[PDB]
Structure 1
């Protein structure tokens, strides 16, 4: 159609999927974006990115109980994301992503590194097993 007297169709596309280490939840009555402490997944458009997103999604959305755990240091990054460890039925999403070789340990800063050694242990095991990013 071209008539200026009628309606006009315009293109649209799908919004890009969220990366695996960004976790959006309902917290204290408000939607909130968390960035997982101590980890770095590939972005969705790079190799293992879709796998990291799908793994986080599966863990979080299948959970009976989700919890949020801030560390001792800064609570929010400069982008206004909550900096947390996130748990699904008692299993830490941050640790699981690293154990699966879907994220590397990263962003290890003073005061916000309580679970550092637990995560490095997961990474060493993922690497020993040549999983995903380590393959």
Structure 2
């Protein structure tokens, strides 16, 4: 897989961010994770975590996987990097997202994210507490 440039337009919630990608505004949904909705327990914490990570980054990148690049809502499906740190992994490692929505062909980083989840769970962090 390959990282490509994007710039932040606006944080939205724990697992969706508005980015400008090839010059066009798009809502991106993070691959392989599910954060609580803002109205649910840990939802505001997930939103805050992703907001801080993308707003503080000097460089955001998106990385598409091998399969579908947009979902049925027209959201981009990618892994997101903030100064080289994967947002998807960081949320899972902090117990603010569960690994989820693991569809065949878009699952390159599944085992990396499962390993982070196992660690967050061993630590009883957030959702796992």
- The answer to whether TM tops 0.5 is yes
Are 2:20 and 2:26, in contact at CA under 8 Å, matched by a contact in 1?
A: yes
Question: Per the alignment, in what secondary structure is the counterpart of residue 11 of structure 2?
Answer: coil
Are 1:85 and 1:93, in contact at CA under 8 Å, matched by a contact in 2?
A: yes
Give the drift of 1:26: 1.3
Partner of 1:79: 73
Q: Which deviations, in whole Å up to 9, do the C-alpha atoms of 1:65-121 show, x marking residues without a partner? A: 100000000010000000000000110000000000000000001100000000000
Give TM-score scaled by structure 1 length: 0.86
C-alpha spacing 1:9/1:129, structure 2 compared with 1 (3 Å): closer
Partner of 1:28: 22
Partner of 2:7: 13
Which stretch shows the higher mean deviation, 11-20 or 97-106?
11-20
**Structure 1: runs of 5+ lacking an equivalent:** 1-6
More strand by share: 2
**Structure 2: runs of 5+ lacking an equivalent:** none
Question: Per the alignment, in what secondary structure is the counterpart of residue 14 of structure 1?
Answer: strand
For the pair shown, the structure with the greater C-alpha radius of gyration is 1
Question: Per the alignment, in what secondary structure is the counterpart of residue 133 of structure 1?
Answer: helix
Question: Per the alignment, in what secondary structure is the counterpart of residue 9 of structure 2?
Answer: coil
Q: Which runs of 4+ in 1 moved over 6 A?
A: 7-17
C-alpha spacing 1:11/1:65, structure 2 compared with 1 (3 Å): closer
CA-based RMSD: 10.0
C-alpha spacing 1:130/1:71, structure 2 compared with 1 (3 Å): same
Give TM-score scaled by structure 2 length: 0.90
C-alpha spacing 1:134/1:10, structure 2 compared with 1 (3 Å): closer
Q: Which deviations, in whole Å up to 9, do the C-alpha atoms of 1:5-26 show, x marking residues without a partner? A: xx99999999999321011111
Instruction: Figure out how many residues of one structure are paired with residues of the other and give that number.
Output: 129
